[PDB]
Amino acid sequence: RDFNNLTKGLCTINSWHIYGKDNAVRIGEDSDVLVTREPYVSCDPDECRFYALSQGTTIRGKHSNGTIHDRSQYRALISWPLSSPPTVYNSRVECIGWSSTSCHDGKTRMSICISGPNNNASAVIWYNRRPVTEINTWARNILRTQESECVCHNGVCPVVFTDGSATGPAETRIYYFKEGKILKWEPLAGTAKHIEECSCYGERAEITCTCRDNWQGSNRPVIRIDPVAMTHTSQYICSPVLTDNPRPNDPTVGKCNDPYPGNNNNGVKGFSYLDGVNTWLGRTISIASRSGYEMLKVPNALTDDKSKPTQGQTIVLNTDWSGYSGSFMDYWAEGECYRACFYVELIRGRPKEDKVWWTSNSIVSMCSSTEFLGQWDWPDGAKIEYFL
Amino acid sequence: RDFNNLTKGLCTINSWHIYGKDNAVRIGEDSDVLVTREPYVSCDPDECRFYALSQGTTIRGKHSNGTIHDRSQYRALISWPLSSPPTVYNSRVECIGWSSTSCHDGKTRMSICISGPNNNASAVIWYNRRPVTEINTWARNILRTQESECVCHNGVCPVVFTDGSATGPAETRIYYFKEGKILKWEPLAGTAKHIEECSCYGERAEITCTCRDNWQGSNRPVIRIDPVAMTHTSQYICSPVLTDNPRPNDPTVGKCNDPYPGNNNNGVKGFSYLDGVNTWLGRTISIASRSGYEMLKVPNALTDDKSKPTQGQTIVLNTDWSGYSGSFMDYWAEGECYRACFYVELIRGRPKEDKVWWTSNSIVSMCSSTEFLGQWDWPDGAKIEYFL
Amino acid sequence: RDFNNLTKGLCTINSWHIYGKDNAVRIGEDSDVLVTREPYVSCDPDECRFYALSQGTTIRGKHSNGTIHDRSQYRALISWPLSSPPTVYNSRVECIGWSSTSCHDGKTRMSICISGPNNNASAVIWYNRRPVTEINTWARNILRTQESECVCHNGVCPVVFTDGSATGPAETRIYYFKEGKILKWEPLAGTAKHIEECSCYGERAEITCTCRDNWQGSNRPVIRIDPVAMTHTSQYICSPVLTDNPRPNDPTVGKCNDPYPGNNNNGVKGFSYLDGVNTWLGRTISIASRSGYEMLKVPNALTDDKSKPTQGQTIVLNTDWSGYSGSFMDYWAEGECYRACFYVELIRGRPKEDKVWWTSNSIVSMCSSTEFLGQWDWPDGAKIEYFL
Amino acid sequence: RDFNNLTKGLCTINSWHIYGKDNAVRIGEDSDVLVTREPYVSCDPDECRFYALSQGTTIRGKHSNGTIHDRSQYRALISWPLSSPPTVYNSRVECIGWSSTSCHDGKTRMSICISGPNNNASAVIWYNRRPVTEINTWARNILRTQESECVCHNGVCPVVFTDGSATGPAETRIYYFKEGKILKWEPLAGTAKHIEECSCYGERAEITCTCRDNWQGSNRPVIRIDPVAMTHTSQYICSPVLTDNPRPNDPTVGKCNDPYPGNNNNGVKGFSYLDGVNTWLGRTISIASRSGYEMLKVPNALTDDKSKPTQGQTIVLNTDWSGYSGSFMDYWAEGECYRACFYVELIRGRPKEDKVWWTSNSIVSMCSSTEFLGQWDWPDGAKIEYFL
Numbered sequence A, B, C, D: 001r002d003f004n005n006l007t008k009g010l011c012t013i014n015s016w017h018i019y020g021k022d023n024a025v026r027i028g029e030d031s032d033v034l035v036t037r038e039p040y041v042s043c044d045p046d047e048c049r050f051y052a053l054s055q056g057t058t059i060r061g062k063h064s065n066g067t068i069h070d071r072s073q074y075r076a077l078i079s080w081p082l083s084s085p086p087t088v089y090n091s092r093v094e095c096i097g098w099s100s101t102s103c104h105d106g107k108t109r110m111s112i113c114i115s116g117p118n119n120n121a122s123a124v125i126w127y128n129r130r131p132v133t134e135i136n137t138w139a140r141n142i143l144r145t146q147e148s149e150c151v152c153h154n155g156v157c158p159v160v161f162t163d164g165s166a167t168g169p170a171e172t173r174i175y176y177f178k179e180g181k182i183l184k185w186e187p188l189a190g191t192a193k194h195i196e197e198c199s200c201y202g203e204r205a206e207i208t209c210t211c212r213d214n215w216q217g218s219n220r221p222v223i224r225i226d227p228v229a230m231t232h233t234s235q236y237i238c239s240p241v242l243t244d245n246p247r248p249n250d251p252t253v254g255k256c257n258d259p260y261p262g263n264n265n266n267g268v269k270g271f272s273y274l275d276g277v278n279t280w281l282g283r284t285i286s287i288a289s290r291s292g293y294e295m296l297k298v299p300n301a302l303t304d305d306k307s308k309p310t311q312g313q314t315i316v317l318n319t320d321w322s323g324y325s326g327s328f329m330d331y332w333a334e335g336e337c338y339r340a341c342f343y344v345e346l347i348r349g350r351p352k353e354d355k356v357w358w359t360s361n362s363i364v365s366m367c368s369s370t371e372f373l374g375q376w377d378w379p380d381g382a383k384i385e386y387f388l
């Protein structure tokens, strides 16, 4: 119809209710489920779907051996119906590649997949299910993008890309696309020192992205974008409640414009909702690995270097495997506010569960409630032993 | 289009004709069929579908071991095409949870799923495939609902919930929703002493629900709701023809305002059509277990404590397993009256058939005919031995 | 839109071209294909589909053992996309039963399924995917119908039913339905002595049905119906070219108003296009069993008791299994005439191939061409040994 | 809507970006994927799909033994969603046969399948999913067609057919169809000596086809068609860069009006984009077998007998199997020019990999970019050993 505009503010988050869960690994033990990783959720005006990077093989398939690897010629961005597992028969390929992002502008969808060898990758921007623009690697070192949905405002959909080192300074660019065409791009600015896999959402004509500083920060870098002026800023979440992984233990005061030290060259895709007192941070419970997952209300986390939790909700027990997590919202729902949502990737197999030769995941997703709901934990649920 | 109004009365039931059957267990012996239980049927203005609570695994899958349990993080309400089995590839998830209800108001559908641990469950009310309202447990003891379709009148769709004990008094509430929002709720009133899993239908601007008194009654409690005044009453079916299970033998006189004694703390979801002489009761043939199923015409059953059968129709032989049963009607069919329909859940596996480690079911469904049709019996049809 | 009217005459049949083939048995050797029998083809204004009576199990499934039986509680009329096999995941159930017919009136479709025990069966007439009318057995001996499509003219869709003996006189009725409601019914009249499984088609406001005289005739009975006057006549195909099976050898002169003797109490569903010189008869090559299949042009076959073939086309070699065959046409195609089409059921398994415990089939279908096309033979193609 | 007209010229090809890949063989190792060969890609105004000739069996199925054969009664043209594999459950049969072509005219699609024994084959032309015209073999020696999409201009869709010898002169005809009806046909003219499997595309009201001279040429014959005058010409690509296979080594000067000698009675379906300096040729890297695949920019290749490459892009390494390749374009995309695309069939199994008894393939497809993108190689990716 018309391009969607971010006219609403976030709803008050008082708790999180269950939104979707596909139990992919449980089901795929005896059904034709594709091996995946790097999942996310994204809405169209009339439907919300699950997204992920397939590995081009079923879990039970012999070609599942080796899927711990991130980039191959057999990966593709696929989408499928909410809470269903990604099967060979219900998955729709959006594009070919090993890194992606996707978002609906209100009229139609833009999907981006990057493929190629490490020193010669390229991004192909699809719009209305047709290829429209291509961008070649500028740093010739694994051109990569968000791994979760982008956000649009009046046709303009900003996307964050990084090309270059994962263990030192890299070259990050913010591209402003409209109908798949590049309107503008700018190099990253601000105090964020390294940017990867940004998790974004929008409200009141502003897009907020919580990313990953793989190089040095255990606190998470944040990029705020103005889709109209097509400009941005960057900093770190100030709060001493650290949210990357692995990470050092929580201090009493964080860092606003520098990476909090203690762990280098590693991290995990993550997210947060930075809205004054209505601020909630997601993070693995373990400071050592992708284990467990919790939501913590940290009022003014982005700007207050001593902010600590005031409420919380456990999503996955520390005795269960978690993984990537990112933001998305149904910008086409009724009501006066945007309901914050998120997904957590539940990784199974390698490297933590090496009795199997594969690596995959299932998805659990929640959205905010203004009620103060009881909590439950949501594990992947599969028994690795069944796969032996 | 416009909200549906219950303007018609029930058609004269002179017999029951076969409506749908999915032979799920038979087929799933060698195909990717999801393990389920607590099924029902529900119509949209242009299509009628099968519904159930998946267990998040296929029957042949190794994760089928243990599906005798009712509440887990791997269950979800799914719907699929009429008479097809619930497969991994054709099932649509309506919401995540282990207790549900769903109904179309004429414009769009409302689905409700409850999830969580026993002392901290919550209901999420979906409307137009989007989450709209959430209700937290009020008694912190397995918040639960109908397990069959709700009914709407001019946008207002009442739903019966129970929170609290299954073996003593509990807290039942009737919620009046419109477009997924709570218009009002009231505590249960009348003479029904315990309410669970209500089976409802509507005609002439009135909704009738036949429920389950798990605590003491072998006769079935009945809740009649006025969707306009948003008020209700409750009593028991007076007739000495008892319809819960397990149950004592049939007496010569029933009880109108108290549970008929003889069996405590147990029961089965069931239903009835209470329409003067056009009254028909469904029930298992066995008074000991979920075995067999029959329809009995008992004129004035609700109000006559000595009413006995005048006609009948066998649905499932006493030598075959039955289970839950509930009401639904296609409120969007042609004609001058609403054709009463019902489904019977045919449970296979545990606990009755313990040679297998799973528990599932298939569905058989019938609707009324004004003709006096010959009868047949409709078993699930699978051979457990094939699964050994 | 509007009800379809049979305003065109048949196109000149100079040969037959391949229309559809699903290779169901070949494919189902390693995929979830439903066991079926009694197939046919039928068109909607915008799509043509395959139809059949499922046995409620896959071919590879253990429940396939025993599918040689015709009537069970696990059968249903299903339809699926043209030339695809009937799989668990792509088959749509039209109704529950072990005998059926179906046809589109131009506005919507009417489907009829008969179910029940031999002495108490009933037909349920569905229209617009909703049950509308029910007809109870009148002779209490396997109420049964066409097993191929019916035909409509201005909303009126006649259907031929038989109730009673298969080895002596029975009670045949012609029902005239409009929107699933019975407008009228009449007992069979004319000289046909026994009627079963009629194969019908329409042109120039007249419906012609070629049926099966199971009792005594090896020539085929014919019922011509006037859908406007709602009246009919019946006789036998006069031609000495006999088309039932099993059957005696071809004589030099046939019988117009009596069954041609030689074989009693047996037969096979078959068809023909009776259009003056443009007359073509279908039949098995073997006079002993459902083996092979051929089309023979027999000018004036219906009215000329000495008519012999003038052209022919082999469809299935006598070294391959055939089975039922019937007529259908796409009444919604472009052009000035109706293109005659037909299907042949290719039965595999029992009783001819008893190394397997099942019985199923695949479908081959052709339509007429005004060209004189080269011919090929179209076997089912599966290797029974693969199933051992 | 309206018939599409070839009003645009080709976009400047500066490189090729990944468009689609189904990894069919990898996935089909453990899922119900149909055995195929002779694939292609073709767009409708609102969707682009993969096409191929199924062998009527799954890869893992026992009936896969023998699929090295090209013509059987079990083959059919099927289409399925872009980048998905051709599965039993997602494949749509367009028609029955062992040779085909298909194209959308802007209003609807025309599909053509040829079937029959070698000396009696026939083509059936389908339009709007209905059979419309039939053409009988004129040379009674394997009537055959393109094996890739045809192209339309204002309703007129030319198709190239060949009937007769594959090792000597044959009878090639160009048919001009409009709405499935034959408007005209002409015998091949010009200097091309043998024509097979033409790969076509259109721009500026002209259709260019790069075909295969199976008889003597290692250079490729070219047919240019005027869809308005309904006339054509034929010649060979002049360039010394030879593109058939097997083939002799590249000389320094090619042949414009005669087959370049060195290899007789063999070849492979291939293609090219002949657009002045914007000319690109596709070809296997190996001169001995269907191994590897590369794109080479050869300015003025069609008319310059000494033209050599100026740029190139590897598509498949010479250490991986390739096969057929052809052209297609999305004539319904936005923009001022038509983006050239192509697919490469990646054959697996027999005859090169004879450890398995089957022959199949997967598909890789690319489209042009005006950017100068980095390249990667795209193998089928399956491990034959897994199939042993």
Ligand SMILES: *[C@@H]1O[C@H](CO)[C@@H](O[C@@H]2O[C@H](CO)[C@@H](O[C@@H]3O[C@H](CO[C@H]4O[C@H](CO)[C@@H](O)[C@H](O)[C@@H]4O)[C@@H](O)[C@H](O[C@H]4O[C@H](CO)[C@@H](O)[C@H](O)[C@@H]4O[C@H]4O[C@H](CO)[C@@H](O)[C@H](O)[C@@H]4O[C@H]4O[C@H](CO)[C@@H](O)[C@H](O)[C@@H]4O)[C@@H]3O)[C@H](O)[C@H]2NC(C)=O)[C@H](O)[C@H]1NC(C)=O
Pocket (backbone or CB within 6 Å): A240, A241, A242, A248, A249, A250, A251, A284, A285, A286, A287, A294, A295, A296, A308, A309, A310, A311, A312, A313, A372, A373, A374, A375, B119, B120
């Ligand atoms: C039914 O459902 C309801 C609804 O869910 C249940 O009630 C919920 O209960 C939750 C658990 O009690 C509760 O969540 C906690 O909230 C605390 C905040 O509330 C408290 O403080 C404020 C401020 O003074 C008060 O207003 C309020 O009244 C409370 O007292 C959080 O502080 C909790 O989070 C911390 O603890 C958990 C352990 O449970 C950690 O996993 C988490 O990371 C937090 O602690 C770490 O981080 C802080 C900050 O840096 C450190 O100070 C601390 O030492 C920990 O650090 C270690 O661990 C981390 C992570 O491993 C590591 O990185 C670091 O290095 C250190 O090693 C928690 O979020 C909900 O708010 C509450 N909801 C409601 C509405 O009440 C109810 O119980 C259920 N009913 C039943 C019967 O079960």
Ligand SMILES: *[C@@H]1O[C@H](CO)[C@@H](O[C@@H]2O[C@H](CO)[C@@H](O[C@@H]3O[C@H](CO[C@H]4O[C@H](CO)[C@@H](O)[C@H](O)[C@@H]4O)[C@@H](O)[C@H](O[C@H]4O[C@H](CO)[C@@H](O)[C@H](O)[C@@H]4O[C@H]4O[C@H](CO)[C@@H](O)[C@H](O)[C@@H]4O[C@H]4O[C@H](CO)[C@@H](O)[C@H](O)[C@@H]4O)[C@@H]3O)[C@H](O)[C@H]2NC(C)=O)[C@H](O)[C@H]1NC(C)=O
Pocket (backbone or CB within 6 Å): B240, B241, B242, B248, B249, B250, B251, B284, B285, B286, B287, B294, B295, B296, B308, B309, B310, B311, B312, B313, B372, B373, B374, B375, C119, C120
């Ligand atoms: C072809 O098709 C047609 C159509 O279906 C077939 O005809 C149908 O035949 C049915 C079976 O005969 C028949 O169903 C029965 O109807 C009886 C009512 O009709 C009779 O009574 C009235 C009133 O005086 C008359 O008008 C009428 O003419 C009849 O005489 C019911 O009473 C029957 O139900 C009872 O019996 C069955 C056993 O078959 C029980 O399973 C059922 O629960 C009922 O009996 C129990 O309950 C009563 C009430 O409390 C007790 O009094 C009784 O002792 C039983 O109690 C024990 O069992 C229950 C359940 O296990 C347990 O809870 C309790 O504690 C006790 O242990 C039955 O419904 C259809 O009406 C009839 N339809 C038509 C249109 O005719 C025809 O046969 C078929 N043809 C062929 C050739 O097969």
Ligand SMILES: *[C@@H]1O[C@H](CO)[C@@H](O[C@@H]2O[C@H](CO)[C@@H](O[C@@H]3O[C@H](CO[C@H]4O[C@H](CO)[C@@H](O)[C@H](O)[C@@H]4O)[C@@H](O)[C@H](O[C@H]4O[C@H](CO)[C@@H](O)[C@H](O)[C@@H]4O[C@H]4O[C@H](CO)[C@@H](O)[C@H](O)[C@@H]4O[C@H]4O[C@H](CO)[C@@H](O)[C@H](O)[C@@H]4O)[C@@H]3O)[C@H](O)[C@H]2NC(C)=O)[C@H](O)[C@H]1NC(C)=O
Pocket (backbone or CB within 6 Å): C240, C241, C242, C248, C249, C250, C251, C284, C285, C286, C287, C294, C295, C296, C308, C309, C310, C311, C312, C313, C372, C373, C374, C375, D119, D120
């Ligand atoms: C490429 O493609 C084209 C197109 O298909 C191929 O050409 C086709 O070739 C067909 C085979 O030759 C041919 O079909 C035959 O046509 C005969 C009719 O044509 C002839 O007669 C008329 C009249 O005088 C002439 O106008 C005409 O020129 C011909 O001479 C039919 O008579 C044939 O059918 C009979 O034979 C077959 C055996 O092939 C039987 O299976 C069939 O049942 C018919 O014979 C039985 O029935 C008759 C009638 O009662 C009996 O008289 C006879 O004895 C047989 O009876 C026994 O068998 C039956 C069945 O088993 C049993 O019930 C009974 O009791 C007895 O035991 C046949 O139909 C096509 O017309 C022709 N098409 C065209 C356009 O030319 C071409 O060959 C192909 N090219 C190549 C290179 O292969």
Ligand SMILES: *[C@@H]1O[C@H](CO)[C@@H](O[C@@H]2O[C@H](CO)[C@@H](O[C@@H]3O[C@H](CO[C@H]4O[C@H](CO)[C@@H](O)[C@H](O)[C@@H]4O)[C@@H](O)[C@H](O[C@H]4O[C@H](CO)[C@@H](O)[C@H](O)[C@@H]4O[C@H]4O[C@H](CO)[C@@H](O)[C@H](O)[C@@H]4O[C@H]4O[C@H](CO)[C@@H](O)[C@H](O)[C@@H]4O)[C@@H]3O)[C@H](O)[C@H]2NC(C)=O)[C@H](O)[C@H]1NC(C)=O
Pocket (backbone or CB within 6 Å): A119, A120, D240, D241, D242, D248, D249, D250, D251, D284, D285, D286, D287, D294, D295, D296, D308, D309, D310, D311, D312, D313, D372, D373, D374, D375
């Ligand atoms: C990141 O990505 C970019 C983008 O892809 C990568 O850069 C690309 O690199 C490609 C490989 O170097 C390059 O492709 C080559 O281009 C050559 C043309 O360019 C050159 O010549 C012109 C003219 O003078 C100059 O303008 C230009 O600057 C270059 O110098 C082609 O000639 C190449 O093709 C030939 O070589 C390959 C071997 O690689 C053969 O497979 C191919 O068939 C061609 O050679 C055969 O054919 C010719 C013509 O007849 C014969 O003369 C020759 O002897 C060969 O013949 C034998 O082999 C064939 C086939 O087997 C057989 O039939 C015959 O009988 C003989 O046996 C090649 O296409 C891209 O243009 C370039 N793209 C860009 C934009 O730069 C970059 O490297 C990547 N980065 C990294 C870090 O990897």
Ligand SMILES: CC(=O)N[C@H]1[C@H]([C@H](O)[C@H](O)CO)OC(C(=O)O)=C[C@@H]1O
Pocket (backbone or CB within 6 Å): A038, A070, A071, A098, A099, A142, A143, A144, A145, A165, A166, A196, A197, A214, A267, A268
């Ligand atoms: C393009 C790409 O390879 N992304 C990979 C990403 C990357 O290596 C990291 O961000 C350092 O740059 O890491 C991970 C990961 O599970 O940690 C998975 C992604 O597949």
Ligand SMILES: CC(=O)N[C@H]1[C@H]([C@H](O)[C@H](O)CO)OC(C(=O)O)=C[C@@H]1O
Pocket (backbone or CB within 6 Å): B038, B070, B071, B098, B099, B142, B143, B144, B145, B165, B166, B196, B197, B214, B267, B268
């Ligand atoms: C929410 C829930 O657990 N419902 C369960 C219900 C419940 O235990 C009973 O109504 C007593 O309260 O019983 C049964 C049952 O087969 O008998 C199945 C349901 O899964």
Ligand SMILES: CC(=O)N[C@H]1[C@H]([C@H](O)[C@H](O)CO)OC(C(=O)O)=C[C@@H]1O
Pocket (backbone or CB within 6 Å): C038, C070, C071, C098, C099, C142, C143, C144, C145, C165, C166, C196, C197, C214, C267, C268
């Ligand atoms: C309703 C029914 O059973 N129809 C059966 C029909 C019938 O027995 C015969 O027409 C004699 O009446 O025969 C056959 C058959 O393969 O020959 C199959 C049908 O399933």
Ligand SMILES: CC(=O)N[C@H]1[C@H]([C@H](O)[C@H](O)CO)OC(C(=O)O)=C[C@@H]1O
Pocket (backbone or CB within 6 Å): D038, D070, D071, D098, D099, D142, D143, D144, D145, D165, D166, D196, D197, D214, D267, D268
């Ligand atoms: C109609 C037909 O059989 N086409 C076949 C084609 C043909 O034999 C050749 O063009 C010589 O005429 O060859 C090949 C091939 O892989 O080389 C495959 C096709 O199936």
Ligand SMILES: *[C@@H]1O[C@H](CO)[C@@H](O)[C@H](O)[C@H]1NC(C)=O
Pocket (backbone or CB within 6 Å): A065, A066, A357
């Ligand atoms: C998987 O691959 C490894 C490495 O190639 C090999 O050694 C191992 O045996 C394989 N595992 C399986 C189950 O094939």
Ligand SMILES: *[C@@H]1O[C@H](CO)[C@@H](O)[C@H](O)[C@H]1NC(C)=O
Pocket (backbone or CB within 6 Å): B065, B066, B357
């Ligand atoms: C199912 O689980 C039980 C309990 O854990 C175990 O003892 C049993 O062996 C399992 N059954 C199967 C078939 O695995």
Ligand SMILES: *[C@@H]1O[C@H](CO)[C@@H](O)[C@H](O)[C@H]1NC(C)=O
Pocket (backbone or CB within 6 Å): C065, C066, C357
């Ligand atoms: C099929 O059933 C028969 C009859 O019950 C039995 O004797 C036979 O062994 C079964 N065949 C198979 C393969 O189970």
Ligand SMILES: *[C@@H]1O[C@H](CO)[C@@H](O)[C@H](O)[C@H]1NC(C)=O
Pocket (backbone or CB within 6 Å): D065, D066, D357
């Ligand atoms: C395939 O067929 C050949 C030829 O009929 C036979 O000799 C071979 O054993 C078969 N291969 C398999 C795996 O069955």
Ligand SMILES: [Ca+2]
Pocket (backbone or CB within 6 Å): A212, A213, A214, A215, A216, A217, A218, A244, A245, A263, A265, A266, A267, A268
């Ligand atoms: Ca980090």
Ligand SMILES: [Ca+2]
Pocket (backbone or CB within 6 Å): B212, B213, B214, B215, B216, B217, B218, B244, B245, B263, B265, B266, B267, B268
């Ligand atoms: Ca009870």
Ligand SMILES: [Ca+2]
Pocket (backbone or CB within 6 Å): none
């Ligand atoms: Ca399987």
Ligand SMILES: [Ca+2]
Pocket (backbone or CB within 6 Å): C212, C213, C214, C215, C216, C217, C218, C244, C245, C263, C265, C266, C267, C268
């Ligand atoms: Ca007979």
